[PDB]
Ligand binder design. Structure first.
Ligand SMILES: CCCCCCCCCCCCCCCCCC(=O)OC[C@H](COP(=O)([O-])OCC(O)COP(=O)([O-])OC[C@@H](COC(=O)CCCCCCCCCCCCCCCCC)OC(=O)CCCCCCCCCCCCCCCCC)OC(=O)CCCCCCCCCCCCCCCCC
Ligand SMILES: CCCCCCCCCCCCCCCCCC(=O)OC[C@H](COP(=O)([O-])OCC(O)COP(=O)([O-])OC[C@@H](COC(=O)CCCCCCCCCCCCCCCCC)OC(=O)CCCCCCCCCCCCCCCCC)OC(=O)CCCCCCCCCCCCCCCCC
Ligand SMILES: CCCCCCCCCCCCCCCCCC(=O)OC[C@H](COP(=O)([O-])OCC(O)COP(=O)([O-])OC[C@@H](COC(=O)CCCCCCCCCCCCCCCCC)OC(=O)CCCCCCCCCCCCCCCCC)OC(=O)CCCCCCCCCCCCCCCCC
Ligand SMILES: CCCCCCCCCCCCCCCCCC(=O)OC[C@H](COP(=O)([O-])OCC[N+](C)(C)C)OC(=O)CCCCCCCCCCCCCCCCC
Ligand SMILES: CCCCCCCCCCCCCCCCCC(=O)OC[C@H](COP(=O)([O-])OCC[N+](C)(C)C)OC(=O)CCCCCCCCCCCCCCCCC
Ligand SMILES: CCCCCCCCCCCCCCCCCC(=O)OC[C@H](COP(=O)([O-])OCC[N+](C)(C)C)OC(=O)CCCCCCCCCCCCCCCCC
Ligand SMILES: CCCCCCCCCCCCCCCCCC(=O)OC[C@H](COP(=O)(O)OCCN)OC(=O)CCCCCCCCCCCCCCCCC
Ligand SMILES: CCCCCCCCCCCCCCCCCC(=O)OC[C@H](COP(=O)(O)OCCN)OC(=O)CCCCCCCCCCCCCCCCC
Ligand SMILES: CCCCCCCCCCCCCCCCCC(=O)OC[C@H](COP(=O)(O)OCCN)OC(=O)CCCCCCCCCCCCCCCCC
Lengths: 168, 98, 347, 70, 96, 315, 98, 102, 83
């Protein structure tokens, strides 16, 4: 059962998405996006991406969802459609899981497989470095153009946000 | 590109990351590097209209390496038969497989 | 805004479009849209009133939604091809999402609902950037992925755009709503000829941009946003009425004016491909655009509407607005038909 | 007097000493008297798995020297 | 002091990387045999399990090319104990 | 044996927290010409037990909360993350030897800001929520210098592993080449942990946990005091590295523990010496004093190894 | 492709359908927009990490940086709406073509 | 597997203490008791932290980036990013964005 | 110059923190282009073998390529040991 950790995490990932997608109060919707983000980190970790996994925790959850919750606290006042939507999404996920395990194969737009995510992993790895770390670190040797446009857009974000919020 | 500034100026802006067969840090290869090299070399300079039918073998192999659809179906066939011969007590796996 | 900051923001609007147009990598195309949208919001809120806040909010929600569909197309195209190159997409589902993402960014029907309301709620200067410059990047991408665009989908968006834009403008008195619907109608013409000859998409885009720019510039000169405020122009700047007449007839596709050239060349290309019913349907339906262009001519140039006594105070002061390139644009937008075979410079 | 503050400090020190002493002794107890093997990169993991097969027993902290060679 | 010490560490890192380089030929040779052996075992239980299925050929590639294709984890450990499949797949990521 | 290892970590942390309250009350007393707790037990050693029993049998205070589920989530998150920031610490051998241990601690400490935020919502007090927003703003602001300062010290270590900071400092403490960063790092840990002179949450006449009294309030207190020890342990590993002898690991722990206690005591030392900042003044300290200097020292510490040929190893 | 893609790709659909169906709160919709990015982040990371496309490993970080910058603009617009009407309900934004 | 088991213990222990701390008091059976305006400056500090945080994400891989053979390119890009981060601080500073007086 | 010898003293008296910041940032931009040890940094990053040195097939006209790792040909790291 431990060999299907990624798939088990993938179900929790969807269930969290049905949580905040049914659009409960923003306080609880933001709680469902923190859980899904945490489960999203786990899936990336189990594919060999450790730096990418921790970026979600440090930036997506620690930096971006904090601002979403912080903004909700002061810019929001604080149903029978949230419950109906949530029930529909959970049933939709359950049927997919049943048919991807019972038959081991489902077809919705794309053709999926149910053997397990481990069957596609690479069988050869003997380097003395982390492959994703070398790729990410290459942003400074190769991604000169990426850095310039990315850094410029962050600077413009500061300029733009201050224009919008001045109010005069 | 709509405007091919990169080719005119001879400056590489984003072509370094367009394909997975390009130069990588520390010469780390991609899992489908060999297949992509063949498809890109088959369909070089003949256009997409010719390439869509003259390089279909290279692309189908490349598509198989990427998503492994035909590899997984064959394995799934092996496993279904194996389990059908064990619910009917008709197959004993060897010790090195158990 | 501080004048220097205004220029920095415009250069970033232009830089994002240029990044989309010079990019061989799908990620840089997405970054160009993100940068372009980031720097367009501040100029949509330069007046700081509720109607500009709503317009920017509706614009933000539509463009952000389209930007996420565009990313999904790129990742799906990556899963099935393993490459990021800006070219034909290697999956039918990726093509539909990219086409619908670019249709939402352009405002084509049935994703058109934002274009009229966003334009009405922002100043004329920002509406001009919205309806002319913002269509250069989505059309640049469509120019490159058209070999893998579903023919039925793209021609369905075109027909709907021509119909909705034609019918929508009939019920309008606000100029910025009239120009918004005229924009949707012309988007359909650009994308209907895309499968057959994408060089006639550039021709229609260039002529439309010139004509649209001329129109907004003359609305900014007199600070007119309504039909009745534009009908006082004969009693202040009579010359500006004749130029509006000429530019409105050209937008309607009447010969011998420039605005006939796109409609003329698109029909020529579609009939070469044995497409007879569609060009006929589009040409006739475009008479809806001509109708509400002709209404503006009646109330601006061909009749003298009632004036106001305070108007007599305006006769003493000149026009101090820049009206940049207006003499050049109005001539290019009306007198270019004899130079039609010059379109091959776009090849 | 100030030295009457020390008995409280002594308890903190002992409590903070236990986690680091316990980990060191448990690692040596669980790894045949040696430090726990550190595998931060996939090459170090490949060797650890190779020792697990060479061990004869399914434990990578049991080393084989020049006695398995003929 | 940090310059002096970090240069020594880079010299110690080159020594460690060269010890790895001197062993890679030996490790590579045995990895090839282990990979080939596991494929051979799978090709034998496939013949036994798929002798009655009609139209089935034993050992048929899914690729049009005859070039060697590095197998994925689902072809080496297809029919082995899940304990050693888990170690092969998630062992490194989970270690400490 | 691993489950025993976790308990050998969790339990002493809570006992270290328990008797840090005693040590804080005596140290402040002796700097104030007092004696501190010396009646309840000999030298006050039983004072922490009396407080614990008293708090956990006092009447619950919970008033009407709009997000009762959020009321229970905040203490769990605060105390779960406080213990989770200890598992990668090398002392000298970590419980979970992570290759990215430094990033793991930044990531977990950037989630503890939710406990502040959720407790403000679950209090149904518009003046408690304002207090939480101020507390959140201060915390995230000083997380910027912690990451940039930490990134500048790793450019001399060469990796995000916490155990490599031991090797990097085998000849010399990193405080000597990076004392400007240590000064700002140390004050950031004060502001991050909401300790004096940055404890404007305790501006009685000038907190978000008021809706917690006894029980859950005791758990928030343990989480906060557990982070002070962890931050000061992190400071010692980062700027006062201890020599590690593989054959005598306990020698490291004794020396390492003494350093981590002195830094913890200095937090009490500071609390007894200064008045506290206004809210705007501790923001101007970060945005207009620390951030300009931290950015300048990050540029310097990226270029310094390159220009001296002292780039550290990747492994 | 692999049943992990089945759920991540279904996560995107749930967030897309959640975004296109507003209830009352603008903030609730901005969360669905930020849930789509997370689903894209995970989908993009899995494909790159599995295929050993080393240079592409920086792409998910760039996606996170721009979408967070976009989200900051979204909150700013939401804050300006709240100041005007006191609440962030999307039903007050109908002055244009009411 | 150790990390998964380590996180489970810490939050399970925290969960147990929270519940007993809510219920252990509820056995004394005590007598029945029978008894914001938005600030734009708090939002601006939260947004500014986010944009600085996104810049920190780009700077985090610097320790690995210094191991490359293109040091002239890497050092330029590294200093460019940090400098542009300083420009943002300079811009907010000069536009009265860091003030707290209304 | 009273302009440059009086402005500097003013900032050093009113904003000593910013003066230090700009001095530290300035040196971080200038010194790398002037240091004589910057070249060594680049040489050391090149001498770190991360991958296997795949041998070259010997065609009989490659005098400068060693046949055995201990032969006198090929790159040498003597500069590093003496650094
Ligand atoms: C093709 C032919 C068609 C050419 C179309 C030209 C259209 C000109 C419109 C008339 C300008 C006007 O009257 O001002 C209104 C309006 C300004 O609004 P405003 O309320 O009057 O005052 C603005 C401030 O609020 C007022 O506050 P302030 O005054 O204190 O400070 C603002 C200050 C600031 O000063 C500036 O504006 C300097 C701006 C420099 C921008 C860079 C120019 C290009 C060089 C790049 C290198 O002054 C101005 O804004 C000057 C007015 C703008 C004049 C610029 C005209 C030249 C640019 C047009 C050529 C096309 C280049 C692309 C245009 C921009 C695209 C986003 O002008 C605009 O902002 C829109 C510019 C035009 C954008 C659409 C152009 C068509 C898009 C396609 C491009 C053509 C190529 C593709 C087709 C082929
Ligand atoms: C490449 C070769 C093209 C050479 C074009 C040189 C003229 C462009 C510069 C003219 C200018 O200063 O204003 C342009 C432009 C806007 O000026 P404007 O209001 O449209 O010009 C009318 C004024 O009355 C302007 O009158 P003004 O009294 O204020 O100033 C007289 C102005 C000279 O004023 C003029 O000559 C304006 C008319 C020049 C032609 C502008 C249209 C662009 C010409 C190419 C378009 C060809 C159309 C396509 C050809 C047909 C295709 C089949 O004198 C100059 O600036 C000396 C020339 C610059 C050295 O400057 C800007 O602020 C935006 C840049
Ligand atoms: C190489 C041989 C050279 C000869 C060639 C023949 C000439 C061809 C010229 C064609 C280009 C025309 C534009 C350039 C001249 C504009 C100069 C100007 O505006 O001031 C005039 C200027 C005014 O003199 P003024 O002593 O100062 O008295 C006025 C006061 O200053 C001020 O007193 P005001 O305030 O009372 O004045 C207000 C206003 C009066 O305002 C009003 O209240 C009247 C409102 C009701 C009038 C409605 C009739 C509007 C007629 C124009 C319709 C436009 C659509 C064109 C459709 C084509 C078929 C017509 O008066 C006007 O200025 C309006 C006339 C100018 C309109 C500009 C039209 C530009 C668009 C033309 C597009 C043409 C497309 C042709 C097809 C393309 C193939 C090439 O006249 C002259 O002094 C000499 C200039 C000679 C040109 C006269 C203008 C005629 C243009 C309209 C006829 C279009 C003919 C098209 C034939 C197509 C077949 C080939
Ligand atoms: C309730 C929990 C609240 C959140 C606190 C717990 C953080 C969870 C993330 C922990 C893993 C991590 O980030 O560090 C990577 C760390 C980084 O370690 P590493 O990068 O050094 O690599 C470890 C292995 N080597 C070194 C050999 C390559 O990963 C690990 O140490 C173990 C590998 C990952 C396997 C464990 C992941 C399980 C999934 C965890 C998430 C579960 C959902 C939680 C929901 C949270 C809701 C907010
Ligand atoms: C060749 C060399 C090149 C590289 C050189 C790089 C370094 C050069 C030297 C840099 C200068 C040193 C910077 C030090 C940090 C300065 C921060 C600053 O801005 O200060 C001014 C700031 C602000 O000063 P201010 O409030 O007076 O106002 C300054 C600005 N004006 C005047 C315009 C308003 O002061 C503080 O930081 C005080 C914070 C409160 C501290 C309370 C607790 C005190 C605890 C003391 C014990 C600390 C022990 C630390 C050791 C920890 C051990 C682990
Ligand atoms: C003012 C507010 C902030 C003040 C913070 C003050 C507390 C921080 C600690 C300062 C005193 C230094 C620790 C002394 C006690 C440590 C005992 C110990 O580890 O053994 C002696 C340690 C020996 O252990 P060591 O491992 O650190 O020594 C070897 C150092 N390396 C790794 C670089 C080779 O040496 C000292 O601490 C001498 C301290 C003299 C300077 C003070
Ligand atoms: C579910 C009901 C169903 O089976 O129909 C799916 C419908 C038609 O698609 P079709 O491939 O014909 O269905 C399988 C036919 N054998 O297709 C659908 O209507 C499903 C809607 C899919 C959502 C598309 C929105 C854009 C997102 C694109 C990403 C891919 C999403 C699809 C994969 C995830 C499905 C869970
Ligand atoms: C060695 C020889 C000398 C070196 C050069 C020294 C001269 C540069 C230093 C000049 C000081 C900066 C200008 C200045 O004095 O601004 C002060 C002003 C303070 O105003 P304020 O704090 O708000 O309160 C006012 C109360 N009356 O505040 C301001 O006006 C705004 C200041 C914004 C600049 C600081 C923010 C940027 C910090 C980045 C630091 C890194 C350096 C940038 C990169 C440099 C690249 C080379
Ligand atoms: C293979 C494909 C697999 C992927 C399937 C994706 C769909 C799974 C479900 C996702 C979760 C649903 C999204 C949230 C829907 C929603 O928020 O609807 C809100 C809408 C407005 O509600 P309200 O403003 O309160 O007005 C009520 C007046 N009485 O309320 C309504 O108008 C009606 C609510 C209906 C709730 C069900 C919505 C899902 C079905 C429509 C999607 C079709 C696809």
């Amino acid at each position: 059962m431990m060999l299907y950790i990624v798939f088990i995490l993938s179900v929790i990932f969807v269930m969290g998405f049905v949580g905040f997608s049914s659009k409960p109060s923003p306080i609880y919707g933001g709680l469902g996006l923190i859980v899904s983000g945490g489960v999203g980190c786990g899936i990336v970790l189990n594919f060999g991406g450790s730096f990418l996994g921790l970026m979600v925790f440090l930036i997506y959850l620690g930096g971006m969802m904090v601002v979403f919750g912080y903004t909700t606290a002061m810019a929001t006042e604080q149903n029978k459609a949230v419950l109906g939507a949530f029930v529909t999404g959970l049933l939709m996920e359950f049927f997919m899981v049943y048919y991807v395990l019972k038959d081991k194969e489902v077809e919705v737009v794309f053709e999926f497989n149910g053997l397990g995510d481990w069957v596609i992993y690479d069988t050869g790895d003997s380097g003395f470095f982390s492959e994703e770390a070398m790729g990410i670190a290459a942003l400074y040797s190769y991604g000169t153009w990426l850095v310039i446009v990315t850094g410029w857009s962050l600077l413009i974000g500061v300029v733009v946000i201050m224009e919008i919020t001045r109010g005069n | 590109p709509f405007f091919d500034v990169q080719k005119r100026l001879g400056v590489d802006l984003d072509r370094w990351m367009t394909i997975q067969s390009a130069e990588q840090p520390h010469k780390i290869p991609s899992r489908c590097h060999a297949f992509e090299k063949e498809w890109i070399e088959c369909a070089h300079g003949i256009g997409s209209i010719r390439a869509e039918k003259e390089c279909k073998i290279e692309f189908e192999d490349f598509r198989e390496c990427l998503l492994r659809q035909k590899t997984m179906k064959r394995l799934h066939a092996i496993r279904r038969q194996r389990e059908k011969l064990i619910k009917e007590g008709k197959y004993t796996p060897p010790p090195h497989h158990s | 805004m501080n004048p220097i900051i205004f220029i920095i923001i415009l250069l970033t609007i232009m830089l994002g479009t240029i990044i989309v147009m010079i990019s061989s990598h799908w990620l840089l195309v997405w970054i160009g849209f993100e940068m372009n949208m980031l720097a367009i919001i501040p100029i949509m809120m330069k007046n700081h009133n509720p109607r500009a806040t709503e317009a920017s909010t509706k614009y933000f929600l539509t463009q952000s939604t389209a930007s996420m569909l565009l990313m999904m197309a790129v990742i799906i195209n990556l899963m099935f091809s393993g490459q990021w190159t800006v070219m034909k997409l290697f999956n039918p589902m990726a093509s539909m999402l990219m086409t619908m993402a670019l249709a939402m960014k352009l405002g084509m029907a049935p994703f058109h609902f934002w274009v009229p309301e966003v334009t009405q709620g922002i100043p004329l200067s920002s509406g001009l950037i919205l309806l002319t410059w913002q269509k250069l990047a989505p059309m640049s991408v469509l120019y490159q992925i058209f070999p893998s665009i579903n023919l039925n989908l793209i021609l369905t968006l075109s027909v709907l755009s021509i119909l909705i834009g034609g019918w929508g403008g009939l019920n309008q008195t606000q100029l910025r709503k009239i120009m918004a619907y005229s924009s949707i109608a012309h988007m359909g013409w650009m994308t209907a000829v895309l499968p057959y000859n994408p060089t006639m998409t550039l021709l229609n885009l260039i002529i439309y941009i010139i004509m649209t720019s001329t129109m907004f510039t003359m609305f900014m000169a007199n600070s007119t946003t309504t039909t009745l405020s534009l009908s006082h122009t004969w009693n202040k700047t009579p010359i500006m009425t004749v130029l509006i007449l000429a530019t409105l007839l050209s937008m309607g596709g009447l010969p011998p004016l420039s605005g006939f050239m796109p409609k003329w060349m698109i029909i020529q290309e579609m009939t070469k491909n044995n497409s007879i019913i569609l060009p006929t349907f589009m040409a006739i339906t475009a008479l809806l655009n001509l109708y509400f262009y002709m209404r503006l001519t009646y109330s601006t140039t061909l009749t003298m509407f009632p004036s106001t006594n305070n108007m007599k105070m305006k006769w003493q002061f000149p026009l101090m607005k820049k009206m940049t390139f207006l003499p050049t644009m109005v001539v290019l937008s009306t007198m270019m038909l004899p130079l039609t075979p010059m379109l091959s410079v776009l090849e | 007097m100030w030295f009457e503050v020390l008995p409280g400090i002594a308890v903190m020190g002992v409590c903070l000493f236990i986690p680091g002493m316990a980990t060191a002794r448990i690692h040596r107890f669980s790894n045949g008297g040696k430090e726990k093997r550190v595998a931060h990169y996939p090459y170090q993991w490949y060797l650890m798995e190779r020792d697990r097969r060479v061990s004869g027993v399914n434990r990578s902290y049991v080393s084989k020297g020049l006695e398995n060679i003929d | 002091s940090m310059m002096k010490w970090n240069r020594e560490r880079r010299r110690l890192q080159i020594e460690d990387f060269e010890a790895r380089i001197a062993l890679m030929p030996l490790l590579q040779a045995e990895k090839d045999r282990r990979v080939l052996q596991m494929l051979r075992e799978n090709l034998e239980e496939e013949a036994t399990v798929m002798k009655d299925v009609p139209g089935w050929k034993v050992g048929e590639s899914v690729f049009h090319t005859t070039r060697w294709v590095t197998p994925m984890m689902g072809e080496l450990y297809g029919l082995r104990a899940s304990e050693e499949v888990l170690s092969a797949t998630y062992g490194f990521i989970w270690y400490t | 044996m691993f489950m025993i290892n976790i308990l050998m970590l969790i339990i002493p942390i809570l006992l270290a927290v328990a008797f840090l309250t005693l040590v804080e009350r005596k140290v402040l007393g002796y700097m104030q010409l007092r004696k501190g707790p010396n009646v309840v037990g000999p030298y006050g050693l039983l004072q922490p037990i009396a407080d614990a029993i008293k708090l956990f049998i006092k009447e619950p205070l919970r008033p009407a909360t709009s997000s009762a589920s959020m009321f229970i989530l905040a203490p769990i998150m605060a105390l779960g993350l406080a213990l989770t920031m200890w598992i990668p610490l090398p002392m000298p051998y970590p419980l979970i030897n992570m290759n990215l241990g430094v990033l793991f601690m930044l990531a977990m400490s950037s989630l503890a800001v939710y406990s502040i935020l959720w407790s403000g919502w679950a209090s149904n007090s518009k003046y408690a929520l304002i207090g939480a927003l101020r507390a959140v703003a201060q915390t995230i602001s000083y997380e910027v210098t912690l990451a940039i300062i930490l990134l500048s010290v790793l450019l001399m270590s060469g990796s995000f592993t916490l155990s490599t900071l031991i090797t990097t400092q085998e000849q010399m403490w990193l405080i000597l080449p990076a004392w400007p960063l240590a000064m700002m790092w140390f004050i950031s840990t004060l502001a991050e942990t909401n300790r004096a002179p940055f404890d404007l949450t305790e501006g009685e006449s000038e907190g978000f946990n008021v809706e917690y009294a006894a029980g859950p309030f005791a758990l928030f207190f343990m989480a906060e005091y557990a982070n002070i020890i962890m931050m000061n342990i992190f400071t010692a590993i980062l700027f006062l590295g201890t020599s590690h002898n593989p054959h005598m690991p306990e020698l490291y722990t004794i020396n390492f523990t003494i350093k981590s206690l002195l830094l913890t005591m200095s937090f009490l030392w500071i609390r007894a010496s200064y008045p506290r900042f206004r809210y705007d003044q501790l923001m101007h300290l970060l945005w207009k004093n620390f951030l300009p200097l931290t950015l300048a020292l990050c540029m310097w510490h990226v270029s310094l190894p390159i220009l001296t040929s002292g780039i550290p190893p990747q492994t | 492709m692999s049943m992990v893609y089945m759920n991540i790709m279904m996560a995107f659909t749930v967030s897309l359908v959640g975004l296109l169906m507003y209830r009352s709160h603008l903030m609730s919709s901005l969360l669905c927009l930020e849930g789509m990015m997370l689903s894209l982040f995970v989908m993009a990371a899995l494909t790159i990490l599995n295929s050993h496309f080393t240079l592409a490993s920086m792409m998910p970080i760039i996606l996170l940086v721009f979408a967070a910058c976009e989200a900051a603009l979204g909150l700013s617009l939401l804050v300006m709406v709240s100041n005007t009407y006191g609440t962030d309900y999307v039903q007050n934004l109908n002055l244009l073509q009411c | 597997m150790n990390l998964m088991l380590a996180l489970l213990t810490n939050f399970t222990l925290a969960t147990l203490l929270v519940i007993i701390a809510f219920w252990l008091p509820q056995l004394n059976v005590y007598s029945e008791k029978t008894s914001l305006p938005f600030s734009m400056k708090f939002f601006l500090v939260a947004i500014t932290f986010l944009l600085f945080d996104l810049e920190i994400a780009l700077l985090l891989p610097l320790p690995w980036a210094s191991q490359t053979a293109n040091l002239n390119t890497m050092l330029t890009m590294a200093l460019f990013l940090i400098i542009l981060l300083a420009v943002s601080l300079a811009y907010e500073w000069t536009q009265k964005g860091l003030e707290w007086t209304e | 110059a009273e302009r440059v010898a009086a402005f500097l003293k003013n900032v050093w008296a009113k904003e000593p923190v910013l003066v230090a910041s700009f001095a530290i940032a300035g040196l971080a931009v200038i010194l790398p282009t002037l240091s004589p040890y910057t070249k060594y940094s680049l040489m050391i990053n090149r001498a770190t073998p991360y991958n296997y040195p795949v041998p070259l097939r010997d065609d009989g006209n490659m005098p400068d390529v060693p046949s055995h790792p201990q032969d006198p040909q090929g790159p040498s790291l003597e500069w590093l040991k003496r650094l």
